[PDB]
Amino acid sequence: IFEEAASFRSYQSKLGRDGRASAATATLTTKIRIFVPATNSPELRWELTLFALDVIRSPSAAESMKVGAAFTLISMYSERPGALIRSLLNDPDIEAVIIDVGSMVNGIPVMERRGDKAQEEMEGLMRILKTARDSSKGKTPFVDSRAYGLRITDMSTLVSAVITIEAQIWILIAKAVTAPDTAEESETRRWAKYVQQKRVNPFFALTQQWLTEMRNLLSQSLSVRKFMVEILIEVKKGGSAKGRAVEIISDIGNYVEETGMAGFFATIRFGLETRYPALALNEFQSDLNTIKSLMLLYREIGPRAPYMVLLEESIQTKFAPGGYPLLWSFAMGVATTIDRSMGALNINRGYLEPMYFRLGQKSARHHAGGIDQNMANDQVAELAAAVQ
Amino acid sequence: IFEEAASFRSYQSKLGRDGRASAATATLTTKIRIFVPATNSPELRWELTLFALDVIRSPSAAESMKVGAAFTLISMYSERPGALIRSLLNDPDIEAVIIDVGSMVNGIPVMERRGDKAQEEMEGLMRILKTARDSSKGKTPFVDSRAYGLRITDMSTLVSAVITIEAQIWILIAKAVTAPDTAEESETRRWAKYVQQKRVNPFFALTQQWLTEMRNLLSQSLSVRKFMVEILIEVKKGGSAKGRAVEIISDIGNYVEETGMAGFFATIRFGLETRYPALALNEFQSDLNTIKSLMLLYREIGPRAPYMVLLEESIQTKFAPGGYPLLWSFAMGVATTIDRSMGALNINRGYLEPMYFRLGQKSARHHAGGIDQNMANRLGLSSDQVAELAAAV
Amino acid sequence: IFEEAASFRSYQSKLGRDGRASAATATLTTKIRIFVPATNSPELRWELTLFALDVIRSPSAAESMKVGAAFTLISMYSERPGALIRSLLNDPDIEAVIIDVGSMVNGIPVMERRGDKAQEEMEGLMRILKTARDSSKGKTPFVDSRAYGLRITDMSTLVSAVITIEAQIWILIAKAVTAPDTAEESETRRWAKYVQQKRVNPFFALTQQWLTEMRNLLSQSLSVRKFMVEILIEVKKGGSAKGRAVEIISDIGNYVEETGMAGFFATIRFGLETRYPALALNEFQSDLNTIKSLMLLYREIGPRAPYMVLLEESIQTKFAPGGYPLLWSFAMGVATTIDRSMGALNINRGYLEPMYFRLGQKSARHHAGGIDQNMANRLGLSSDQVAELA
RNA sequence: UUUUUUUUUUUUUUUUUUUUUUUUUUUUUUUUUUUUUUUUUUUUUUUU
């Protein structure tokens, strides 16, 4: 009877989700040059990393080069850097041309072995490096000068350094695409952790100016974020020992997950998991039916789910908290009142519902020790008064 | 209805844990030299141990050599030292070259395996040893100098000594990777135990100077800790004999378990097992869900669990002190009030909720143990003495 | 709900107990020489016992020799002494080479089995014996010197004496590895019993000096204690008749069981079994959950259980009383108050919490000795008078 | 015939304690002793 209606709401939500989109929708693939370390021989590997860091640091380099550079910077981990990119990278927007870096023995620029027209390319590289130095007023990518110069000849030093720079990229990702302004506080907080825990060697700190410029580039460019999120999903999967490098990535993942899906999680954390007396109110019923549909939907979206927001995934829109407004307004009202540090994150959206905002606030604090009825039941007063 | 939400929180927590991880995640492996006991003949075993002690003492050895040295030092236990390392040690960041020492013919150091195209191998060693002596102002590994010169000749003395030094490595692990500063009081307290119980042989006691240098080495090297945790898991398993060597390790283990997962166990010990009427609080329902999801998660992570922190294991993040809600403040508020040993611990965490941390204190201290209250279990005959207990409180 | 948490605590406690340990963990073996009785005729048996008493008494003997001597000393029981050692001895740190010495006509030492590659074996023995005499200032194994001299010629005298010496080894075990100082009072208390009961033959009484030297050897050698505990377990098994020999072992056992697991037993006896009205007190509920996990764990450890501490068996650490602090501090507070003989144990340990201990004391004492909650009903109508008397 | 709104914004490495310490045997009492059986009473009587 009424069961039909509820099932119909769910039917609408899932209708036309299935099947496969017609191939004509596939957009014109954009060609990018991606340098990959040609072997794990430290002289080439260090120089190639420095080249790539400088490409990203340059005021003069074009976006097509800069994406390719960012991909080099966050593939330094691999035993076979080019294989790692090619094998994980699964994105219709971008078509990579992979250059196995090799002997970086053409001075400051990366090696290029095609011949006479590549002599222009090496001089493009030279211009890029010069302009990088000059435009930054002598500050290189790293904060402490000696480190920028320091030639590495052994695997041990190499991995110490590479892991350190990579971790400094992955520091960013967590906030680059949820709000890359306001970003510094959080990214410093995460940096402090990795250094204090001795996972990252602080001599290799990369300069705030460069990191901000790169964070913005990551926010604005999809192709880079696609590769990052591909790797972030792949190494999050369990059932294997890792190298210190992939381990640091995976560890950072536990900050990166759910990020920029705030609303979805806010209704889950506050209101739903809270299981407040408010939930009995008639107004909520429609919203509860909605959330049921949402939870089953979330399941169906599957492996990309922890990073829906970072991937700009459209299905993300369905999960967005604005979708269930009564419960969300109550979920803000509880959260802001009850959980001391939260609620400083700005939930002042236009669709916030005054009744629920006041009722949510009133719910926790107005009742004391669970209000009308404690969840899982003499001495439920004085102590309760002091607590809230 | 509501059951779906709880199951969904659990779903999120386990999502993507499944399958087998894509091969491209393989990290660049670091090539590292492990000298390993070639035969169990006392003069070579003592000399190799002195080499290794000095590698760790040296200002002049590189960290790549020092990790490999630490692996030699804490493999001295074995009947076949090199086999023990090679067969248990299974962590991808490090790729071992194993060199079986032929009782170290040359002098202080290891002998050149095939004869030295460059005999400077032993000189790199000589420099390492000299720099070690010189930088340490002559101070030898042991607290009593006679030990430093011993030149041991018999199995019995050798095992007495090796067991003693190994135990002195394993004393460190317990704190090296949870708080390598503030360590001294605890690590001395554990040393005193093993000596007083006559398990560990005090003639061979190792100097605070040596122990600090090695504690630092442990903190700063992952590769070493990986081998240590591999062995620590392996010997924790039952179903055999234990020899004095493995027994000392296993004994150390009972201090080492759970360590630096403070927050996780604290919610279990304080708040949960405490069974305070306080669970009934509104905020509590969610927090209970988190623990259930967490507890079932912990189970599923399995073998690594007792040492998550030390192994840098990511899932550890979920177990993290910060995330647990009401307990992260309420479980501490109770714990600090009720358990005299607790609270000496540093509880500076940003996740603590002040109001809820005092409610936990109040819940216990309400009657000085909730006297004339609580006592949920009613298996007890009599109702009278609740009041008496409250008066005692 | 809450049930999950309790089950999880239990899961942690049993996690990783399972499986069979990888072979690399096998510890570097010590080679020890054990002289055993090659024959059943006293002439040899008395002389070999004197040799062995002196090996243990020696200031100049190596620890490797001393362990092997102790194994000779506490295998004199057997009809086939070598078989008894070889067949029960099952500990990985130590590998025995056993040569059953017949002649023993050398003097103080044995007679070298196949003849010695060096006659210096016999001279090593001579050094051992000389150093033993000299270092002891001539005070011999026995308390009355005639016994030390007495050459033994008959089975009857032999068994009387061997039983006597063996019992003097087994009196030590009970305290050597729990409290090897403070020892004398207890070991003498047990000696008095065996002699007064005429089970062990006082003609063979062994000197305080000898007994302290052997007690110290037991404390400082693990390999010895392993063999002792192995024998102590093996002969404790029922379904056999026992002769004077096995009977003295089994008798010693009644002091030896539970020993050095003090804390575990005390919480069971005092506080827990006592079922004081305070069990329900919320403060202890997890403690109680803890102890339950402990008890079920203890069961699971099985065969070694009555001697875990003496075996240095790891799992023992978990069982150690510091582990359940609230319950323990209260189990002591009660125990000290209620049981007149207890409390003579030094419990000045870090786990004891004054407030909870004072609760144990007052709750028991002001309770009028656990009158706080009595469990007994159906005996009949309650005596108010009796309650007041208590 | 139909008419509204709908991206995001917080926090998240950690820090305690944890070897043990008692007392353990035995002691009292142990057979029996009393009593016996039987004995009394026991047809009927009015009226129709």
Numbering used by the authors:
A (entry chain I): 4 to 380, 387 to 397
B (entry chain J): 4 to 396
C (entry chain K): 4 to 393
Paper text:
The NiV RNA genome is encapsidated by the nucleoprotein (N), forming a long helical nucleocapsid assembly. This assembly not only safeguards the viral genome from degradation, but also serves as a template for productive transcription of mRNA and replication of the nascent viral RNA genome by the viral RNA dependent RNA polymerase (RdRp). Each N protein monomer is comprised of two main globular N-terminal and C-terminal Ncore (Nucleocapsid core) domains, with each domain flanked by the N-terminal arm (NT-arm, residues 1–31) and the C-terminal arm (CT-arm, residues 373–398) subdomains. The structure shows that the nucleic acid lies within the charged cleft of the N protein at the interface between the N-terminal Ncore and the C-terminal Ncore domains.
Aside from the common helical assembly, about 35% of N protein particles were found as clam-shaped assemblies which can be further subclassified into two distinct primary conformations, a spiral clam-shaped assembly, and a semi-spiral clam-shaped assembly. The spiral clam-shaped assembly is composed of two N protein spirals stacked face to face, as seen for the Newcastle Diseases virus (NDV) N protein assembly. In contrast, the semi-spiral clam-shaped assembly features one 14-subunit ring and one 13-subunit N protein spiral stacked as shown on S7 Fig. Asymmetric reconstruction of both assemblies leads to 4.3 Å and 5.2 Å resolution maps, respectively. Models for the spiral assemblies were built by rigid-body fitting and real space refinement of the N protein protomer taken from the protein-RNA complex described above. The structure of the N protein monomer within these clam-shaped assemblies remains largely the same as in the spiral assembly, with an overall RMSD of 0.9 Å calculated over Cα atoms. For both assemblies, there is a significant surface area buried at the interface between the two halves of the clam shell, with up to ~670 Å2 of buried area per monomer. Interactions across this interface are mediated by hydrogen bonding and polar interactions made by loop segments A1-H2, A2-H5 and H6-H7 from each opposing protomer. The surface area, buried at the clam-shell interface of each monomer, is about five times larger than seen in the clam-shaped assembly of NDV, where only one protein loop (residues 104–124) is involved in the interaction. This likely creates a closer interaction between the halves of the NiV clam shell as compared to the NDV assembly, similar to that observed in the recently reported clam-shaped assembly of the Sendai virus (SeV). No protein models were fitted into the seam regions, due to the lack of interpretable map features in the CryoEM maps. Since the clam-shaped assembly has not yet been observed during replication in vivo for NiV, it is also possible that the formation of these assemblies were induced by the conditions used during production of recombinant N protein.
